[PDB]
Structures are given as structure tokens and as C-alpha cells.
Design a protein around this ligand. Structure first.
Ligand SMILES: CC(C)=CCC/C(C)=C/CC/C(C)=C/CSP(=O)(O)OP(=O)(O)O
Ligand SMILES: O=S(=O)(O)C[C@@H](O)CNC1CCCCC1
Ligand SMILES: O=S(=O)(O)C[C@@H](O)CNC1CCCCC1
Ligand SMILES: [Zn+2]
Lengths: 312, 478, 9
């Protein structure tokens, strides 16, 4: 049975404040007894800007009922700072939260704020936590964005060693092996191998193409691998023609063909067309765009038609 | 010829290549779910007994919205910080559906939102005595006021006008040196914030050079190798994208960028790769077996809400491509028919029930998916283009001697160089905001005229008939 | 039957 906060001696000196909705508000929520009471007292606490243990406990009470309550999260962090609480303990508390609230902007930002403040010399333990976090939901956007920030932020502090980068790529390779269709993992690979400041840009490019082409041959209809290939070639200003022989069959490592691989692959045709454009063969490129528009990728009939006219 | 119906095309599963994975398992399951529904439903284009009718069930959707508009169960506490969104999703949907609110109810809407307004500046997800200002509630509240408000003393617009300086100061408090904005005090930084801020700043005539500095660079750097935009970018002591290209963040980025293009600053805004953005956009439209709805990320599932986020970005990316080609020197760019078919056949709640629209079959309808399905539907039904000749006409009628007091900048030199450049900026921003027109004869209403909903504006996502009187009020161009 | 998890805020 719920004990109202007005009947609790620890809160006797506090006068609760009612929500100021105004007259007959729209979209009003029928708050539970607990939630309303908690907010009545949070309003009083926040208005007088009290920084105490009871206020801290109150914020936890509220965010558990509403993990998206950004006002209360903001207040909670200021409480952790003012009371000089153990941020490591708070982080452990967030490990329970993150389990059930994987898509709360506020939980993830709170975790970012904690690690920025704690600023460990080696974030390896947090990185491993994040990895384990991705097992039950390998495509969680917030988590991937957070992983990016983590490595990015701590690399600027020079706290990411070469062995650490190496193990991270190893981990990313394993992720893509488990599911080559995980576009999130491909994105992480791009950061590790291309975009990050410390990316190896040498022979290295050649190794990458090998990986990409092999990925394509493993799963010819994998839109992720194709986008990565196109992005890669475009970023490093590399010609398509020389690699064409590896893609031609779907219209350096070569294809096999795996069972259940209907031809042609639309993105393979886009590659062939862009190859012709690179060769100044506008009419041949137009013809393949026309095929994409009329037969092989009709959902995008208009777009491919657009690309066709772009040649003429 | 360039927008084939899902029913006219071959529906086949995404090929496995003999390599199964978690992704494919989910994709195949979703494919079956959507296919079965299409198989049970009458082709909207045909002139069959027993088949389900796919007509837009506007009255059911109206009731769905009405049932939650005046009271929500305690479970909705998970959205307590997003009540301005609950208002927006509802009043915008009603606009699209062609359902008028009486003046009494509009007044209630205005009253509710005005109580979310802090004297310090900006709207929160609830009453000012309960929640602090946030960029997202501020967008949602402002747009809702444009939809339900008016210029009378109880119309709320007056209150916005008076709050211009404080809303501006709130925006400046959110501003980061790298070009990003925090969504709220101590809040997260991503393009959702940029988009919401830029819309409001544009509509209320509170744009200044100091507000925009680096904003363009932060957005540009969000574009990934895929062509779409991630949530944010990181500035290394170069700027790097922090995640996958995402429909939601691509929408905010494209829209943000477009809003910036009408600001007359030098070498501003930093360019994006328009063609790549268009390519990524059109590549997200699903195969026939998945109803031709959009997905939000490569190798993820189609979701009715991306009809707006991804579909709504199409005419923007298209306009940016057009300009990019004219910078060196027509059929539709996505399947407008298929998208409508997904909405009618798959995104509507089953008939004779609660109404509302949903993410996919198997998912409950909700206010959010109702609003975004319909917004996307509008984009597919009406050929929206940004017209240079309309922008010119706007320039010619603009009256620079009329307008609200200039916002005072935080930094002494943070404002426009002089009154002349300020008025030129005012004209450009205003003229372009009203540059979106509906191409005559460009209308395509799958299933017949009874399915027609109203025309939403790209970038802003409110009806044109709401946008114009609203922005004209704050620029004194009525 | 199942609730959708599309959070924008
Ligand atoms: C304009 C504004 C304030 C908001 C719109 C921008 C949007 C929609 C952002 C959502 C970004 C994220 C974290 C999506 C993952 S939900 P998911 O993983 O369940 O969905 P998905 O699987 O990617 O389809
Ligand atoms: O308009 S809709 O598609 O939403 C559905 C709707 O209104 C059904 N009412 C009909 C017609 C009147 C007699 C009872 C049955
Ligand atoms: O597009 S047309 O306007 O030529 C005609 C049109 O709208 C038909 N609506 C039908 C008929 C009445 C029941 C509901 C569906
Ligand atoms: Zn959705």
C-alpha cells in the first residue's frame, strides 16, 4: 500500500506544488497516485533548488516511472555533482536501467555525461560493457552512436592504444561474421578503417577492397556491402573499371554462385552503369539505367529514368 | 509509367544467397506479414468479392484521435515529457484529414501549450512549473499554435511574438561552438535539435549570424558514406559522422540544410552531397513484397513513420539536386503510388476497430504513426516543388518597413552587419519559406478522390494554409 | 497487438 509523501516525516517540511496545467488542458494524462505525488514534491524541490539525498532519491523514483523525463534527469545529474556522489556507483545503477530502457535518449546521454566526468585513463571496461550490451540488440542506434563518441572522445585524450584499436576491429569483424547484413557494424567498420583520424591509409586500401569484395561474394544481395563498396571507391577517388570483372557476373576476389541468388542484382547494374559513365560511354550507361527502370528494379522506375536522362 | 503499383509487380522475398542471419530472419517474417495483407486486400487501383476494401478510413482515424485527445490512461506517463508532440500529432493529423476543431477546442489547445512556455524562453514537454524548455517541445508547440491558434488576444500568436527575445536567448544558451545545439540544459546534441530550432527561428523571424555559426558544418559532417545523415558529428582537434545514415536524422539534416540555404551569409551554408542524399532516400523504399513502404536504415524493417521522415525528404533532396545541376550549367523520383498503397493497405488499422495508423501489421496504431503515415501520404499524393518564380513573386511583394522588433544578440557584433543586410535576410528567409507550391496536375490519388488528404509543406510539415498566415504574422506581411 | 518503439524524444 502506497504511503503518501504528505504522511512521511522525512518530507513534513516540504509543501508540495500542483502541476500548473491551466484550465481544462488537452491531452491530459491520468497520472497514477505514485507519479502525481512524486511530481508534486519534485516541483517543490526543484523550485527551491534543494540539493539533498532525499531529492536524489526522489529523482530515481521518478525516472523509473518515466525514463524519458529529461527535466528530472537534468536535475539528477546536478545532484550527483553537488552532493559529490560516487559516479562509479551511478554508472552501475545505469547498467540496470540500460537493460530495459535501450532506446531512452536520456539514459544514454546521462551515461555519456558520467564517463566524460569520470574520465578514466583506460575506458576498456566501459567499451566491453557496450559490446556486451549489443548482443541482445545488435542494431541499437543509441548504443552505436555512443560507442562512436566513446572512442572519439577518449582518442583525443590519447588514451586509446594501438592494441585497443586492433581488438576493436577484431570485434567488428566478428560482428559482421555473425550477421553480414548488420548495417550498424558496417558503419563501425567505416569509422575504424576510414573516417577515424588514426585510420591506416596506405596496401591498406587494397586489403579493404579484398574484404569488401569477399563480403559481396558471400552475400551478393547485401545492400550494406554494396553501399560500403561504392562509398569506399568514392571516398578514395578510385576507378570502378579495374574492379568491374568482380561485379560483372552479377549483371581481386571473384564470385563463385551461391544457391538462391537471382540475377541480376540491381546494385550490380548501378555499378556497371556508373562504370560506363566513368568510361564516357553515356549511351551504354543509359541503356542499363533503362533496364533498371523497366525490368530489374521497377520500384525505382522514376529514379532510374532520372539517371537515364542525366546521360542524354 | 514510372510509378508502378505493388500489385502490378512481382513480389519475391529478399534472396538469402544461402547465408541466413538474424536480419534475414526478421525481414522474411515481416515480408510474409505484409504480403498476406496485400493478398487479402483489394487492389486500390482496380474497378474481388470478399477482399478487404483499402479506402482511407478517415472517420475511424478521427475517432482514434478524439479518444485520446481529451484524456489518456496512466500508462502514457512514458510520454509525459512529450505532450506537445501528442498535441501536434493530433491537430496536424486532423488538418490532413480535413477535420475542423471548433473554436472552443482550439482555445483549449492554445491554453495548454501557453502553459508550457517558460518566461526564460522556450516550451517544455509540460507546464513550466514542471519541466524545463526543450528544443523538440518548442517545435511541436510552435507548429501546433500555427495550426490551432490565431491573432486574437486568446489566439496565442501574440504570446509567441512577445516571447521572441526570450526564445532566442534560449536558443543561444543551447548553442555549442562546434555548430550543434543541446536539446535542453545539459541535454544531448544531435540534428533533431538543429532542425527544430531552425524551423522555429525561421517562422518567428529570430535568425541572426551568431545563431547560425558552424551550424552548417555540423550538419554537413553528419552525412555518411551511404548518402544519408547520422544523428551527429564529432569535431577532432576534421568532423566525423557518429553513426548510420538514418531516416529520422536524414530528414532533420536535409530540412535543416534547406532552411539554411535561404540565409544570405557568405560561403554559407557548407554544401552537402545532394545526389548521394537522393540516392540513399530512394534506396530506402521497400520492395513490392514489403508494400513499398520506406525503411529507416539499410537492412532494417519498413516502418510507416518513415513515409514522412524519408519520403518527406525526397522533394527536398530533389530540389537540392536540381540546384546543384544548375550550378554547373519530369517523372517522380520515388514510387508515389506504392507508398500510398502501403499506407492504405498495410498502415491502416484493420477496419471496424479502433482506427489510427501504425508502423506495420502486428503493431498497435498510435498518435505518432498516425501523424507520420498521413504526412507521408500527403507528400506522395501531392507533387510539392520549391518554385523560384514563386520566391521571386514573394520578393516583389515583401514590405521591409513592416516587422517585429529585431532580436538583441548576446554578443555585440553577433547581429546583422546593418539594417540593410538584416532586411535582405528577412526577405530571403521569408520568401523561401513560402516558396513551396503544389504542381497543378501533379496530383496522384490512389483509390480515388475520397482518399485525398490535404497538402502538407515539405521541411515544416504543416499545411500551407497554416504556414502562410502564421509566418506572415511574425514578419508582418499579412 | 504489440506496441511500437519509435522514440523521437
Ligand atoms: C524530428 C524529430 C524530433 C525526430 C525524428 C527523428 C527520428 C525518427 C529519430 C530516431 C533515431 C533513432 C535512435 C531510431 C532508432 S528507433 P528503431 O531502431 O526501433 O527504428 P528502426 O529499426 O531504425 O526502423
Ligand atoms: O468512414 S470509415 O472508413 O472510417 C468507417 C465508417 O464510418 C463506418 N460507418 C458505416 C457507414 C454508416 C453506417 C454504419 C457503417
Ligand atoms: O475518384 S473518383 O472521384 O472519380 C470517385 C470516388 O471518390 C469514389 N469513392 C468510392 C465510392 C463511394 C464509396 C467510397 C469509395
Ligand atoms: Zn515507426
Amino acid at each position: 500500500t502506497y504511503i503518501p509523501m504528505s504522511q512521511r516525516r522525512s518530507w513534513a517540511d516540504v509543501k508540495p506544488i500542483m502541476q500548473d496545467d491551466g484550465p481544462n488542458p488537452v491531452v491530459p494524462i491520468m497520472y497514477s497516485e505514485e507519479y502525481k505525488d512524486a511530481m508534486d514534491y519534485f516541483r517543490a524541490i526543484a523550485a527551491k533548488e534543494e540539493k539533498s539525498e532525499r531529492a536524489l532519491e526522489l529523482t530515481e523514483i521518478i525516472v523509473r516511472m518515466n525514463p524519458a523525463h529529461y527535466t528530472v534527469w537534468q536535475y539528477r545529474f546536478s545532484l550527483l555533482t553537488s552532493l559529490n556522489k560516487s559516479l562509479e556507483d551511478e554508472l552501475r545503477l545505469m547498467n540496470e536501467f540500460a537493460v530495459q530502457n535501450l532506446k531512452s535518449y536520456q539514459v544514454w546521454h546521462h551515461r555519456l555525461l558520467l564517463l566524460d566526468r569520470i574520465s578514466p585513463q583506460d575506458p576498456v571496461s566501459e567499451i566491453e560493457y557496450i559490446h556486451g550490451s549489443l548482443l541482445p540488440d545488435p542494431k541499437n542506434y543509441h548504443t552505436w552512436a555512443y560507442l562512436h563518441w566513446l572512442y572519439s572522445h577518449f582518442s583525443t585524450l590519447g588514451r586509446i592504444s594501438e592494441a585497443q584499436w586492433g581488438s576493436e576491429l577484431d570485434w567488428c569483424n566478428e560482428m559482421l561474421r555473425v550477421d553480414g547484413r548488420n548495417n550498424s557494424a558496417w558503419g563501425w567498420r567505416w569509422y575504424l578503417r576510414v573516417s577515424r583520424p588514426g585510420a591506416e591509409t596506405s596496401r591498406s586500401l587494397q586489403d579493404e577492397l579484398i574484404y569488401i569484395l569477399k563480403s559481396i561474394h558471400l552475400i551478393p544481395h547485401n545492400v550494406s556491402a554494396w553501399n560500403y563498396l561504392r562509398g569506399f571507391l568514392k571516398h578514395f577517388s578510385l576507378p570502378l573499371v579495374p574492379i568491374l570483372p568482380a561485379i560483372l557476373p552479377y549483371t581481386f576476389p571473384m564470385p563463385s554462385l551461391p544457391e538462391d541468388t537471382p540475377l541480376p542484382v540491381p546494385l550490380a547494374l548501378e555499378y556497371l552503369a556508373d562504370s560506363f559513365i566513368e568510361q564516357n560511354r553515356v549511351d551504354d550507361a543509359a541503356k542499363v539505367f533503362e533496364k533498371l527502370s523497366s525490368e530489374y528494379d521497377q520500384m525505382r522506375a522514376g529514379y532510374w529514368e532520372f539517371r537515364r536522362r542525366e546521360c542524354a | 509509367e514510372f510509378t508502378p503499383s505493388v500489385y502490378s509487380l512481382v513480389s519475391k522475398p529478399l534472396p538469402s544467397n544461402s547465408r541466413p542471419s538474424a536480419t534475414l530472419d526478421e525481414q522474411a517474417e515481416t515480408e510474409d506479414l505484409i504480403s498476406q495483407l496485400f493478398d487479402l486486400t483489394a487492389d486500390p487501383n482496380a474497378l474481388e468479392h470478399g477482399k478487404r476494401y483499402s479506402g482511407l478510413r478517415k472517420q475511424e482515424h478521427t475517432q482514434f484521435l478524439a479518444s485520446s485527445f481529451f484524456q489518456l490512461p496512466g500508462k502514457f506517463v512514458s510520454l509525459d515529457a512529450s505532450r506537445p508532440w501528442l498535441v501536434f500529432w493530433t491537430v496536424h493529423s486532423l488538418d490532413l484529414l480535413g477535420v475542423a476543431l471548433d473554436q472552443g477546442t482550439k482555445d483549449r489547445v492554445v491554453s495548454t501549450l501557453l502553459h508550457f512556455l517558460s518566461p526564460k524562453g522556450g516550451f517544455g514537454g509540460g507546464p513550466a512549473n514542471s519541466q524545463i524548455p526543450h528544443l523538440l517541445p518548442t517545435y511541436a508547440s510552435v507548429c501546433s499554435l500555427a495550426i490551432a491558434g490565431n491573432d486574437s488576444s486568446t489566439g496565442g500568436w501574440k504570446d509567441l511574438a512577445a516571447a521572441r527575445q526570450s526564445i532566442y536567448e534560449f536558443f543561444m544558451r543551447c548553442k555549442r561552438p562546434d555548430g550543434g545545439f543541446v536539446v535542453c540544459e545539459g541535454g544531448e546534441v544531435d540534428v533533431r535539435g538543429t532542425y527544430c530550432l531552425l524551423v522555429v527561428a525561421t517562422l518567428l523571424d529570430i535568425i541572426t549570424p551568431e545563431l547560425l555559426h558552424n551550424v552548417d558544418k555540423f550538419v554537413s559532417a553528419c552525412q555518411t558514406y551511404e548518402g544519408g545523415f547520422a544523428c551527429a558529428s564529432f569535431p577532432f582537434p576534421c568532423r566525423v559522422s557518429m553513426a548510420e545514415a538514418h531516416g529520422g536524422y536524414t530528414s532533420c539534416s536535409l530540412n535543416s540544410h534547406f532552411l539554411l540555404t535561404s540565409v544570405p551569409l557568405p560561403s554559407f551554408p557548407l554544401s552537402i552531397d545532394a545526389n548521394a542524399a537522393l540516392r540513399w532516400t530512394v534506396l530506402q523504399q521497400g520492395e513490392p513484397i514489403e508494400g513499398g513502404g520506406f525503411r529507416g536504415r539499410t537492412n532494417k524493417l519498413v516502418d510507416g513513420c518513415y513515409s514522412w521522415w524519408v519520403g518527406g525528404g525526397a522533394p527536398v533532396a530533389e530540389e537540392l539536386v536540381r540546384r546543384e545541376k544548375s550550378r554547373k550549367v519530369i517523372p517522380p523520383i520515388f514510387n508515389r503510388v506504392a507508398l500510398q498503397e502501403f499506407t492504405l493497405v498495410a498502415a491502416q488499422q484493420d477496419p471496424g476497430s479502433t482506427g489510427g495508423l501504425r508502423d506495420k501489421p502486428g503493431k498497435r496504431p498510435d498518435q505518432y504513426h498516425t501523424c507520420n503515415n498521413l504526412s507521408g501520404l500527403s507528400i506522395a499524393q501531392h507533387k510539392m516543388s520549391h518554385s523560384p518564380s514563386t520566391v521571386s513573386s514573394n520578393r516583389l511583394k515583401f514590405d521591409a518597413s513592416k516587422g517585429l522588433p529585431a532580436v538583441k544578440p548576446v554578443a555585440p557584433g553577433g547581429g546583422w552587419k546593418n539594417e540593410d543586410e538584416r532586411q535582405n535576410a528577412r526577405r530571403e528567409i521569408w520568401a523561401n519559406a513560402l516558396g513551396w507550391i503544389e504542381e497543378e496536375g501533379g496530383e496522384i490519388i490512389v483509390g480515388g478522390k475520397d482518399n485525398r488528404i490535404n497538402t502538407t509543406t515539405p521541411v515544416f510539415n504543416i499545411l500551407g494554409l497554416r504556414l502562410k498566415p502564421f509566418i506572415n504574422y511574425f514578419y508582418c506581411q499579412e | 497487438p504489440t506496441a511500437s518503439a519509435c522514440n523521437i524524444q
